[PDB]
Design a protein around this motif. Sequence first.
Motif, PDB file in Angstrom:
ATOM      1  N   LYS A  42     -18.045  -0.665 -14.778  1.00 51.32           N
ATOM      2  CA  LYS A  42     -17.722   0.597 -14.145  1.00 51.32           C
ATOM      3  C   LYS A  42     -17.728   0.535 -12.616  1.00 51.32           C
ATOM      4  O   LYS A  42     -17.498   1.543 -11.947  1.00 51.32           O
ATOM      5  CB  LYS A  42     -18.615   1.705 -14.691  1.00 51.32           C
ATOM      6  CG  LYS A  42     -18.024   2.319 -15.970  1.00 51.32           C
ATOM      7  CD  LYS A  42     -18.885   3.420 -16.504  1.00 51.32           C
ATOM      8  CE  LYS A  42     -18.038   4.503 -17.142  1.00 51.32           C
ATOM      9  NZ  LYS A  42     -18.824   5.749 -17.407  1.00 51.32           N
ATOM     10  N   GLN A  43     -17.958  -0.659 -12.074  1.00 47.79           N
ATOM     11  CA  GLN A  43     -17.873  -0.910 -10.629  1.00 47.79           C
ATOM     12  C   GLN A  43     -18.733   0.079  -9.827  1.00 47.79           C
ATOM     13  O   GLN A  43     -18.234   0.898  -9.038  1.00 47.79           O
ATOM     14  CB  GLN A  43     -16.407  -0.908 -10.151  1.00 47.79           C
ATOM     15  CG  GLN A  43     -15.513  -1.968 -10.817  1.00 47.79           C
ATOM     16  CD  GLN A  43     -14.026  -1.639 -10.685  1.00 47.79           C
ATOM     17  OE1 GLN A  43     -13.440  -1.799  -9.619  1.00 47.79           O
ATOM     18  NE2 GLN A  43     -13.420  -1.159 -11.771  1.00 47.79           N
ATOM     19  N   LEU A  44     -20.037  -0.002 -10.053  1.00 47.86           N
ATOM     20  CA  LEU A  44     -20.975   0.860  -9.378  1.00 47.86           C
ATOM     21  C   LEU A  44     -21.616   0.162  -8.180  1.00 47.86           C
ATOM     22  O   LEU A  44     -22.222   0.827  -7.340  1.00 47.86           O
ATOM     23  CB  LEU A  44     -22.016   1.418 -10.363  1.00 47.86           C
ATOM     24  CG  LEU A  44     -21.497   2.163 -11.614  1.00 47.86           C
ATOM     25  CD1 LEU A  44     -22.643   2.716 -12.464  1.00 47.86           C
ATOM     26  CD2 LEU A  44     -20.535   3.285 -11.285  1.00 47.86           C
TER      27      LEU A  44
HETATM   28 NA    NA Z   1     -16.784   3.457 -10.208  1.00 43.37          NA
END
Ligand code: NA
Length: 87
Positions: A42-44
């Motif tokens: 989710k590219q956090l």
């Molecule tokens: Na994101």
Amino acid sequence: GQINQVRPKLPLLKILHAAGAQGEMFTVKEVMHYLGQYIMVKQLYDQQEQHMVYCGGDLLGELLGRQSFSVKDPSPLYDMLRKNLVT
Ligand code: NA
Ligand SMILES: C[C@@H](c1ccc(Cl)cc1Cl)n1cnc(-c2ccccc2)c1-c1c(C(=O)Nc2cc(C(=O)O)ccc2N2CCC(N3CCCOC3=O)CC2)[nH]c2cc(Cl)ccc12
């Protein structure tokens, strides 16, 4: 049964499942490994500053009660796990 350590609550479990996990029973290490993968798919995190995680606006942020955190400070994670992991 004997190899597993925890059963996670439905919010944390929905996250673990989103990361590719199956079932209801896990080791603590698994839970952390799945949260790590969750953060990555989710590219956090900041790709230019890896130790910073930005979870505000995501289910994980809600669960941790935070906007962002450094992975160098276990605090909000350990505290969240204690509230979401049934032994
Ligand atoms: Na994101
Ligand atoms: C030690 C660990 C950590 C740090 C803090 C805490 Cl409290 C617990 C934990 Cl196990 N770690 C360090 N960097 C991240 C982390 C940091 C940023 C994003 C995602 C995870 C993590 C996290 C893991 C994780 O399992 N990491 C991990 C564990 C192992 C192992 O058990 O032997 C080996 C390698 C590991 N990592 C894989 C992706 C790598 N990574 C990160 C992005 C860049 O590319 C990359 O290869 C960075 C190292 N899980 C998490 C869950 C949450 Cl909520 C937050 C962070 C992490």
